[PDB]
Point group: C7
Chain length 139, copies 7
């Protein structure tokens, strides 16, 4: 492959999705989450030179964050909070970039992964009412 797949974390209780394109790398990503359930519910992604917004999950959270990524801007730090198991969920995401930008979405009360780093090219996982999530990098 021309890609590196981060471990997808939390569970199998959703519906599979893969957002990647030759169109290029991620230019913006949004996380929607709730104080009520302390979960990620909904993610949206836009790629370089492509105005289609690829969404998954139910946008029912009372909070969202957007990170915008310059074309030459990499992820140098990355943490996903989650509930472990087969009935697992993604609870939170923390990203830090080569340009000193960072975002913090949701909660981090149980399990954590510190992922591979590099140029963010896509996301894979499963979502229904809630977000499983794995990041995808270049080389």
């Amino acid at each position: 492959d021309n890609y590196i797949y981060s471990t997808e974390v939390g569970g199998v209780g959703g519906t599979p999705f893969t957002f990647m394109q030759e169109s290029g790398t991620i230019t913006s990503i949004k996380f929607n989450w709730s104080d009520q359930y302390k979960l990620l519910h909904h993610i949206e992604v836009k790629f370089i030179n492509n105005a289609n917004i690829y969404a998954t999950g139910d946008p029912k959270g009372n909070h969202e964050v957007i990170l915008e990524i310059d074309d030459d801007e990499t992820i140098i730090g990355s943490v996903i909070g989650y509930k472990k198991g087969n009935d697992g969920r993604c609870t939170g995401v923390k990203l830090t970039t080569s340009k000193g930008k960072s975002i913090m979405a949701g909660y981090f009360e149980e399990s954590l992964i510190t992922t591979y780093t590099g140029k963010l090219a896509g996301i894979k996982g499963g979502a229904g009412s809630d977000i499983r999530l794995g990041l995808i990098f270049l080389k």
Copy 2:
């Protein structure tokens, strides 16, 4: 063309505004906000070698901040606080420059965007009583 448009965040309300100058960049930017409503209400911009103030929104807030930007000075840090959805609003702004200058206006209690960075060229959105909606605009 020459420009990177940050996502306009906030609601669909307000009177539209697009303040940009060809071969010009922002030299000063003012945010007006209220403790009462925890909203941005009014913004003004000046461009390089031009004393005319491009204003939008109702200057009814009890606080304002100005950032002045040297001609060679870029935005390296940029956050807009807002309320999401169709009846959304801009609540706050945080900017930091390549020369270590920063400003903070308003509140950050719901949604955040961490925008593109670079040389600030314009702003676009909608405003009436409030800043309903705001997107920053950079060069490349």
Copy 3:
């Protein structure tokens, strides 16, 4: 001119003043302020190779600060606290230099400007009992 004029912030009131000297920069600046009114009241300036003290405003404040500036020393950070509107005032000033010197005068409870930076050449505004209005002036 060979000069950059920072936004004058504060009200329209007071008697106008402009302290500048042809190719000679500020080497000392004093701010006088009160706890009672939380305002700047009085400012003095001295220029390079000139022993005249240029003053404005009523020195009725219970506090003063002086910054002295080496000939090769620039302002890298600069904030003026003020009350906005026609009935406005300067409440405070914060300066930081290329040599890690800083001063803090007065209060910052309402509005702020983060100004242009560079070599401080002069100041302009209006004052009577109070500093109604203040803007800094720099070189290139």
Copy 4:
């Protein structure tokens, strides 16, 4: 040898395990632990160019962490908390990498080892219900 062996710390108990491959260095490692027992209970490891998960221990902890390691990324900081002696246990691990990444699992209430550093090639020890014992293994 091609390899540097950290001291195995903890007890003599559990079923012995060695996770190493001629086909690669470690690309991912997971620690599972409990607040209830203040122990490590379960570990999993994957190597470069090999899709098998090598697991040991009972995944009965209420917490897990995963660290993923870029191919060119080394361990610069490394600490294992444990209870000493024959009936000992591993209680905690702290890892920090050449790329500023770190993870922290479990507790550090008794004994500590600060290990050799370098490229992590695998782990050795014993586990049953808990991680009785752990030793890290590096290249040169």
Copy 5:
């Protein structure tokens, strides 16, 4: 001159004094101060290649500090706390050097000057029971 004169701050009272020598620069300086009155009371200075101690003021303070200055060591930070006006006093001093030495004497409850910096060549002012007034003097 080949000298830079920092503003003398404090009152106009006290016996006048000038401690400078062509013999050379300040090698040691002492400040004496009181908790009771929150004032500087007494100063002593020694120069390079000169064994005289030049003293002024009444050594009635319950605290003293000495800074000793290597021949090649400059002042990079300098603050004098004082009470402004005719009946003013020096209350405090903070010095920091090119070698990361600093001293702190006395109190800072009213007015401040952040002085010119450089090689400390002497001091002038007025003292009696108190240091009513102080101004530093530097080289070029």
Copy 6:
């Protein structure tokens, strides 16, 4: 010698020990200590290219720490806590390395030495039930 001997600190009691190997430096060192007596009780050392464990003192403490030292890794910071006098003891050790590793064993409630630094080659002292006395030994 090709060796620098740190001062042995502690009492004159216990059985004497010297752990050194010709052209072989310390690769691992363990300290054992008790909360009950706030003393070091037992130390073990291993050298480069040699699988023997050289121990001294009674391993009766409820805590141990191990430091492993990469072949090219030096001590840049070093403290031994002790009780002074003829019936003195070692209470604690604090080491920091050229690779940012640091360890802390035992207690620091009485006397301290900040030792020579460099490549740790050996240790000398005395021990019985306790570590009576300890001195580090370095290369050049």
Copy 7:
């Protein structure tokens, strides 16, 4: 001649001492102090290539510290706490070296000197039951 004498601080009492070696420098220095009296009581010094201990004062303190100094290692920061006047005493010492080593002895409740810096060559002063007085001595 070859030497810089720091100001001796403290009182006039005690038995005089001057510990200096031609073509030598201090390799170890010990301070003894008491919580009871908050004074330094006793000091010992060893010089390069010489095993003899030069002592002064009564070792009656409940605490001691030793600093060991590599032959190429200087003092970059140095502070002596003391009680001023004829019946004065040394209360405390803080030393920091060109290798980031530091020690702290005793108390700093009254007066301070920040001394000259450089290569520590000797000490001079007076002591009986206490260190009445101490001055450091450096190389040119």
